[PDB]
Amino acid sequence: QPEPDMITIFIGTWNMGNAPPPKKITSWFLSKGQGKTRDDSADYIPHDIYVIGTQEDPLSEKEWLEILKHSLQEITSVTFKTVAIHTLWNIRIVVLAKPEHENRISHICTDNVKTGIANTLGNKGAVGVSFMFNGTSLGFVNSHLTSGSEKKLRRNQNYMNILRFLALGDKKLSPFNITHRFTHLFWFGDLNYRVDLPTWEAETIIQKIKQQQYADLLSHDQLLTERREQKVFLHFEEEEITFAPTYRFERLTRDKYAYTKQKATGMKYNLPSWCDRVLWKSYPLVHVVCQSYGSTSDIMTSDHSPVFATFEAGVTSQFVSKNGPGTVDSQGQIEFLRCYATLKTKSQTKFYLEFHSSCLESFVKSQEGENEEGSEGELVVKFGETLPKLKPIISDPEYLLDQHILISIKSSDSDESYGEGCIALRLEATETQLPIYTPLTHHGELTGHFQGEIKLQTSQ
Numbered sequence: 001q002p003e004p005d006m007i008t009i010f011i012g013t014w015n016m017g018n019a020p021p022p023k024k025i026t027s028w029f030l031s032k033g034q035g036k037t038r039d040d041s042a043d044y045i046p047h048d049i050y051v052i053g054t055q056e057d058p059l060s061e062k063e064w065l066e067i068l069k070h071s072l073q074e075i076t077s078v079t080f081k082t083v084a085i086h087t088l089w090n091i092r093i094v095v096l097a098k099p100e101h102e103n104r105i106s107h108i109c110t111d112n113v114k115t116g117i118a119n120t121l122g123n124k125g126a127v128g129v130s131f132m133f134n135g136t137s138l139g140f141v142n143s144h145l146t147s148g149s150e151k152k153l154r155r156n157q158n159y160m161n162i163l164r165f166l167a168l169g170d171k172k173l174s175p176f177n178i179t180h181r182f183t184h185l186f187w188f189g190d191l192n193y194r195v196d197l198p199t200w201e202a203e204t205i206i207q208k209i210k211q212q213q214y215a216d217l218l219s220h221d222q223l224l225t226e227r228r229e230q231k232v233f234l235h236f237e238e239e240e241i242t243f244a245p246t247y248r249f250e251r252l253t254r255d256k257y258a259y260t261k262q263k264a265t266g267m268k269y270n271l272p273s274w275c276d277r278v279l280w281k282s283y284p285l286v287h288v289v290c291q292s293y294g295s296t297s298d299i300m301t302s303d304h305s306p307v308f309a310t311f312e313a314g315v316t317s318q319f320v321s322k323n324g325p326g327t328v329d330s331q332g333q334i335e336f337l338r339c340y341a342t343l344k345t346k347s348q349t350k351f352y353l354e355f356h357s358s359c360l361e362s363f364v365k366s367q368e369g370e371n372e373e374g375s376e377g378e379l380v381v382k383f384g385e386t387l388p389k390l391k392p393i394i395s396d397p398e399y400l401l402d403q404h405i406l407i408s409i410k411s412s413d414s415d416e417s418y419g420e421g422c423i424a425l426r427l428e429a430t431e432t433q434l435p436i437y438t439p440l441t442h443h444g445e446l447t448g449h450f451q452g453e454i455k456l457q458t459s460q
C-alpha cells in the first residue's frame, strides 16, 4: 500500500435557501454545469476528500449525511467515511473521505465562530474542520457572511473575526491563526459579496449574464475588488470565475434572476452576484492546482446555485527514521544569515522570533533583535547572524525539503505576536546560502516582512 504524494479534494458550497434539496444532486459532486467543469472521463473516479459547506441548511445532520453518502455511493460505488460534521445554526460543514484514508486521517478538530453583536449576532458566522492527512495538515472553513450589497466592510470584519477566533489545528501553534496553521486551507461559503453596480443596471447585468460576458460584472465584484485593495482574504487565491452569478435565482428554474426589492428582502435589491465562493491558501511551494470551479445548472430548490471546486493537493507521508521522531538527527540543521524583519508598528519595544515547525521537537525562541529606523520611517529588527541553528528531528532530504518554518515576531514586553509568516524548506540547493522571504501578518492584516538567507544541511 504506497502512501500518496497527491490527493484530490472536492469543495462544495451551497446556500440551500431553507429548502430541502431535490432528489438528485450528483451534478454538484461531479463538477458539472457552468464554469471550469470536470472531464466526463473522471466521473467514476472518487475524490479523496469531499468537503460540503451549506448555509440556510434546513436538514438535520442525519438527513444531510444520508443524502450526501447515497449521492457519492451512486457516483462512485464507494461508501465514504464521515470524518467530521459541525453545524452552527443553519451553517454546516461535512467532511467525507474514501475508506482507504481512515487510518491516514487524525487530529480531527471542529469549531464555529458567531459573527457580530446583539442585532448582528444570531445567524451569520462560520464552521470549520481541520485534520492531519498523513504528514499534511488540512483546514476547511465554511462561512456565511453578512448579506447586503452595502455591507462589504461588515463582511471583511466577519472574515477577520472568523480567522482570529476559529480554533482549529495544532494549539501548540499559539502565535498563529488558521491562516498559518495548515499546509492547505480552503475557505468557502456564502461570502455574500455582491456585484456593485447601480440598481438601475439590473436588466443590463442580466443581459450580460445571458451573453456569458462576465468581465464587466467581475470588475465590480466586491470580493475581487476588496481583495485587490488588500482589505480581505490577503494571501488567499481564487480560481478565475467563468460561471454565471449564483444568486439570486427564482426557485425551480435557473432562467430568471430575482433582484427587485421586496418586503422579504428588507427592501434591498439583490443584483445578480457571485455570493458563493471557494478560496484557498497553501504553504509556499506546495502543489495545489484548481481542477474545477463552477456552478450547477440543474439544482434549483434554492435561490442560490451550488458551487463546486476541486483541487489536486500535495501531501507528505508520516516519516519515520532510525533517529526522529523522538530525537534530533545531527546530520540536519537550518541556519539563517543576514535576517531582518521590517515592521509597520509605530511602537518601540524589543522583539524576538519564534520558529515553529513539525520538523522541530518544539518551537525555538531567538535572542532579541536590534531595532533600527528604516530610510522611509519603518522599524527594522536586525537579527544579522544571531538567529539560532535549528535542529530538525529528521535529516533525510526527502523529508526535510518538504517542511516549512512558521515565524512569529513577538514583543519582549508583552510576548504578543506582531507578525506571522511561513518559510518553505523546498530550496533550490542544500548547504548553499539562499534568499528567504515571507510577508508578516497579524489578524490576517499585513504588518511587515521577514527576509534573509537560509543554509539547509540534509543527510545528502
Ligand SMILES: N#Cc1ccc(N2CCNCC2)c(F)c1
Pocket (backbone or CB within 6 Å): 081, 082, 083, 084, 097, 098, 099, 101, 102, 103, 105, 106, 108
Ligand atoms: N475517514 C476517517 C476518520 C478518521 C478518524 C476518525 N476518528 C474520530 C475521532 N476519534 C478517533 C478518530 C474518524 F471518525 C473518521
Ligand SMILES: N#Cc1ccc(N2CCNCC2)c(F)c1
Pocket (backbone or CB within 6 Å): 219, 224, 225, 227, 228, 229, 236, 237
Ligand atoms: N479584481 C481583482 C484582483 C486581481 C488580482 C488580485 N491578486 C493579485 C495576484 N495574487 C493575489 C490576488 C486580487 F486579489 C484581486
